[PDB]
């Protein structure tokens, strides 16, 4: 039906496939999205910036409650199941039977129509990458995966064999859900024996992106390769830095620095050769976006970029400040929309700087701290930050949260498994870790992007490592006495309070939350020993 034969899709259970649009160019996608006869959520609008904008419907973020993984002989003893030992997680078990029902709904839905099939790679390295095949009936969805995943060359497509198949049946729902013990009529299901992901009900593109990240998070650590929820860049001297963090904490904004070559902004692996990007694009947040503060991200918004849920006025101009649809407004663009990037392949050497970004809503943690090896493990496992996004934050949150490894929602294995491989990679490279508060302090306002950038610079240029430091009580974090380019006043979180006693109060409350959260890791001699690295009242 074009590139692919209708019979190859029949193997997946899809029938009467009328027309196949295989690996569409950006030009065909542009034409497809602007088709005047499109209706509903398939419709695209042209903005004054040249980029097309879409409305993802009801779902403006991920639906963790609708995430299920089939429990069978492949995943039984390896997955970090939500219903097993100590472990707050979204890995809810699903029966092969219910899975077959869901598959029937999606294949029936995709049957008898024109489909968009995009073949792409997840992982920059040939040896550990997943060849993924995406099937959708909605043009902008194909566009999303074209932007986010690694676009294969013509010769690569020649002998392309899918390792994983993602079927997006956003238009259908499961009416038998109550009867089947599911959360709702929507679903994001994974089956590792069949190597497939099914999406129903939710149009949100993030589900495909994070779904494959969840799969990489399962496969890579099993072979000794770290799978990380971080941004990464390289300086001209070949020095690599990785920035860990949750939604909206600064991974994207802080890694996009003109003096450094961007490797990626969200998901990376770490093998014997170094750090590699899993993706071929960036997924930036756009609420309150200002070209003055984020010129590189602003300029990447042009033809081929795909805006999501932003408010477009009558004259086609965008209102980036408007969060009435959702505060989780986004834009995806192929990585090349950023000028200073690593190419042709998104990879670099071993990371020597590991930065943990935390958006502290309590206004307790210092702007920056140099972590000891034990504190590194402790804070990585604790993953304290704020859920300021992921479905609509920046006003409906920040919700204080402890997200193991700074990405609990995408972990398929136990948090300790990610911690050990990461610690292994850091040791071999002599990497140092730092904790950075991109959140709030005593002023009730977020730390300015300018002060944060100066801090990142200080870390990257080593001025932080050679600065005199003193210990912050309770948390026992080593903070610099002064830093070039940064206002000395903010370095000590107690100073932003009219009384350090006010700080004491909040700091004791936060410390208790940390101690409470960590107790679930004290089971092993290791976890038990790490308690000494955490807060002490
Ligand atoms: N000091 C600061 N440092 C970083 N980001 C800041 C700061 N002050 C405000 N922000 C805002 O916080 C948000 C951080 O978003 P960013 O896209 O970097 O999050 P992320 O870590 O990449 O999240 P995700 O995992 O969802 O991609 C941006 O909207 C940015 O403008
Ligand atoms: Ca992310
Ligand atoms: Mg991002």
UniProtKB/Swiss-Prot annotation:
Pfam annotation, one family: PEPCK_ATP
Family matches, as InterPro entries: PEP_carboxykinase_ATP, PEP_carboxykinase_C, PEP_carboxykinase_N, PEPCK_ATP_CS
Example GO biological process: gluconeogenesis
Keywords noted in UniProt: Acetylation, Allosteric enzyme, ATP-binding, Calcium, Cytoplasm, Decarboxylase, Gluconeogenesis, Lyase, Magnesium, Manganese, Metal-binding, Nucleotide-binding
Keyword check for Transit peptide: no
Top-rank taxon, per record: Bacteria
Chain sites annotated for binding Ca(2+): 146-147, 149, 280
List of residues binding Mn(2+): 210, 229, 266
Binding site for ATP: 210, 229, 245-253, 294, 330, 446-447, 452
Induction: Induced upon entry into stationary phase and by cyclic AMP (cAMP). Repressed by glucose (catabolite repression) and by CsrA.
Activity-regulation annotation: Allosterically activated by calcium. It may represent the only case of a monomeric, allosteric enzyme.
Pathway: Carbohydrate biosynthesis; gluconeogenesis
Signal peptide annotation: none
PROSITE patterns (UniProt xref): PEPCK_ATP (PS00532)
Role summary: Involved in the gluconeogenesis. Catalyzes the conversion of oxaloacetate (OAA) to phosphoenolpyruvate (PEP) through direct phosphoryl transfer between the nucleoside triphosphate and OAA.
Protein name: Phosphoenolpyruvate carboxykinase (ATP)
Organism in which the protein naturally occurs: Escherichia coli (strain K12)
